[PDB]
Design a protein around this ligand. Structure first.
Ligand code: NCA
Lengths: 170, 58, 422, 211
């Protein structure tokens, strides 16, 4: 019923800033979760696609999950998902592929999106605070629903969840 | 090919050629079934079953 | 002179040409593959020449691709090729006629001579257009007809509950093509979803390879068709192809333990590796056959496939007469309704609720898309339904005339406005 | 934080079915959707709802039906459920006569065009065998698949809205809707193996408990 997170590593964590304090906060709020954070900067939107192609070909057999945060502002998301269909990435099949995005959907077996509104950022700060307070009690969908409540109270972030079982962080 | 022409000795001289006789001869002489001969005559289409006109068939 | 054979055997060809004309004229698959003919109403012997060429090529291709075989794998092509084959039909209708069996195809059963029945899932009319063929399942046991068949089910579905076994020696099988799988569902069933699970469970490795392995993969959705001459060699020539890609104890110790007993050791092998079918043209008329009762009938099958002799025995009391009438209402079977009304006297009390299993009230059942005008008019005449009463559950507020207007049944709209006020 | 769904009556339910498509479109028909409609009928009526079947509607009928329920007084009921059994593409739903945009169905429920349901769960379950709008407590459960195999018999409609009923039969008194939907999406693509998978768009700001 719950995705196994007892694998050697608890996945990767790639943060991209295609254009500050929000990504800086993401650094520690994901590093404390025992992740391998790979920060980046401004890029041209073809080398980034090739980079996700590179990280697609890696021995993720020891990772428990996978995260991909995209702090963006002219590129196709299909050209990024194409390398992660799980049919080629045999070491990620049956394991989460989190895509937290801030700026049409590709349907696939085990993805999850976190679309947000461009107007640190309230979405990112709320997410970091929520993950700091409740990480060991509630599962991910309840975390994101409370984030939705906080954002809409103080457009509403979407949640396109194609998960097959539950997420947890302990 | 000429056998297809000349087995029809009981001819109507280029006409219906006694469709009733065709219905009854196949019944009595080779032991078929009526549900098959009434299908064959239906596939013979309309009156005027010319021995040569019907079998411009190849 | 008794030369009526020279016209019977010619008119049989004339009939079979018109049934291969449909399949070679229509059909997406044959146009895509390049084996299609034109639409000309009345076809000719070209519809037979094309089948002969197709069978020749579909056999010669696998023969050439297959190796030159040996002393062991060429005797199998004589134990199988020189055998005895019998065809099963398994339909629920009433076909015995006492001493004459006549089974027709859909294109003949619906060619303005509409006898109730039918079993076909959508898709066959466009891809192949072989709905003019009396399909038959094949049996390789070889023994006599009068013994009950050991097979009971086709690929997955048990079609009927009344086996009609016929011998190969009929003259109507001359122009019947054979295909190793269902012509549309070209899929050998896996080693788990196959009949007679005891034999397949005896050999574990066989099931892993007798799964969904399609045939003629040049266009995915093909399946080779072999005529009468080339249908017996191509079964053995494909058994060899399957065997020389298998590593199991069955590859020796049963496939050559069947040599001296060609019954339940050859049929259980071939009907598990393959699921063959025989496709006879328009009609199959015979005086010799075997009507073997396998399974007792059901009300749903007796009403769907209209069989009055079986219905009059299945229906025992009014408590079943009401169920039979409810089955007839939601199918449009006028003959069943007439039979029940002539043999029963109903009353409006028992028609005030849908029996468990039905999903519509009486006034909606009588007025839906597939309802029959005869039953509607008869129910209105007996006064067992109110012509002016609105639906409560489905489409609430509307009335039967609104249904008759939505769907466009003029013969029903007139019958409604005439028999009532509306 | 739960939702406090304990109003006098527990919401409304609307089921729309299209089975005999009008010949002006080209689609032949849909097979065995009446059993799906009856299963949803029973399952959602078990949840103290008020189901309202509507079989074989047209575009102009669907839009007016949705509009005339938008102007009702849902003040004493705590939620709203709408189920759409029809044919269509990624983000379009088909009536008997033609297509109607899914955007123009939820417009009458945007919250600025109706005050009866302010911050209330407006569940949508589409089985059209993705340009979705966004607002408040909207939850869309969208699927597009006839199944995996076994065409023969249309055994109990389609996988999605029978697994949904199976999970709401037992889990719906101890779990919340996001968990039931994940377990449905797990039963699908599991009893589907030899390909399409449903997607769950959820803008809910609270936790949905059906008790
Ligand atoms: N006529 C049938 O029901 C049948 C039997 C076997 C194969 N195909 C069809």
């Amino acid at each position: 019923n719950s995705y196994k997170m007892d694998y050697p590593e608890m996945g990767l964590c790639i943060i991209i800033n295609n254009k500050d304090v929000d990504a800086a906060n993401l650094r520690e709020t994901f590093r404390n979760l025992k992740y391998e954070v790979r920060n980046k900067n401004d890029l041209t939107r073809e080398e980034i696609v090739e980079l996700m192609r590179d990280v697609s070909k890696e021995d993720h057999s020891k990772r428990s999950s996978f995260v991909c945060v995209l702090l963006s502002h002219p590129v196709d998301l299909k050209k990024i998902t194409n390398f992660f269909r799980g049919d080629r990435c045999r070491s990620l099949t049956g394991k989460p592929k989190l895509f937290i995005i801030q700026a049409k959907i590709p349907v696939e077996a085990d993805f999850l999106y976190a679309y947000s509104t461009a107007p640190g950022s309230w979405f990112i700060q709320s997410l970091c605070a929520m993950l700091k307070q409740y990480a060991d009690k509630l599962e991910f969908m309840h975390i994101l629903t409370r984030v939705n409540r906080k954002v809409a109270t103080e457009q509403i972030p979407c949640i396109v969840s194609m998960l097959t079982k539950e997420l947890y962080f302990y | 090919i000429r056998e297809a022409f000349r087995v029809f000795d009981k001819d109507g001289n280029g006409y219906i050629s006694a469709a009733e006789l065709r219905h009854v001869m196949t019944n009595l002489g080779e032991k078929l079934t009526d549900e098959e001969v009434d299908e064959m005559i239906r596939e013979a289409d309309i009156d005027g079953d010319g021995q040569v006109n019907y079998e411009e068939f190849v | 002179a008794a030369a009526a054979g020279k016209i019977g055997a010619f008119l049989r060809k004339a009939v079979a040409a018109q049934s291969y004309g449909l399949m070679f004229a229509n059909g997406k698959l044959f146009e895509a593959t390049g084996d299609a003919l034109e639409k000309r109403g009345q076809y000719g012997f070209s519809a037979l020449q094309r089948l002969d060429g197709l069978s020749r090529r579909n056999l010669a291709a696998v023969e050439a691709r297959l190796g030159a075989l040996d002393s062991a794998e060429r005797g199998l092509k004589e134990r199988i090729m020189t055998g005895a084959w019998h065809f099963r039909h398994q339909s629920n209708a009433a076909l015995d006629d006492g001493k004459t069996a006549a089974i027709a195809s859909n294109h003949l059963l619906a060619r303005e001579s509409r006898s109730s029945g039918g079993n076909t899932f959508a898709g066959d009319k466009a891809l192949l257009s072989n709905h003019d063929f009396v399909f038959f399942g094949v049996e390789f046991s070889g023994r006599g007809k009068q013994d009950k068949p050991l097979n009971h089910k086709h690929s997955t579905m048990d079609f009927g509950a009344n086996a009609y076994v016929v011998p190969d020696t009929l003259p109507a099988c001359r122009h019947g093509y054979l295909t190793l799988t269902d012509h549309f569902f070209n899929r050998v069933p896996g080693g788990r979803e196959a009949e007679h699970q005891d034999f397949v469970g005896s050999f574990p490795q066989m099931g892993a390879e007798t799964g969904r392995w399609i045939h003629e993969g040049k266009y995915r959705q093909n399946a080779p068709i072999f005529n009468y001459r080339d249908m017996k060699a191509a079964v053995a020539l494909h058994l060899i192809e399957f065997l020389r890609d298998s590593k199991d104890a069955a590859f020796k110790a049963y496939v050559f333990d069947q040599a001296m007993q060609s019954g339940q050791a050859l049929d259980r092998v071939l009907n598990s590796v393959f699921q063959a079918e025989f496709h006879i043209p328009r009609l199959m008329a015979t005086t010799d056959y075997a009507k073997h009762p396998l399974r007792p009938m059901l009300l749903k099958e007796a009403v769907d496939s209209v069989n009055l002799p079986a219905l009059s025995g299945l229906v025992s009391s009014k408590g079943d007469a009401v169920t039979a009438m409810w089955h007839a209402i939601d199918k449009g079977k006028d003959a069943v309704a007439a039979h029940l009304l002539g043999n029963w006297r109903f009353e409006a009390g028992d028609f005030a609720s849908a029996p468990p299993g039905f999903y519509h009230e009486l006034n909606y059942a009588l007025s839906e898309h597939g309802a029959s005008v005869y039953i509607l008019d008869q129910f209105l005449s007996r006064g067992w339904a109110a012509v002016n009463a609105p639906f409560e559950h489905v489409n609430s507020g509307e009335t039967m005339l609104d249904n008759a207007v939505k769907y466009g049944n003029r013969e029903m709209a007139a019958a409604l406005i005439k028999h009532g006020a509306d």
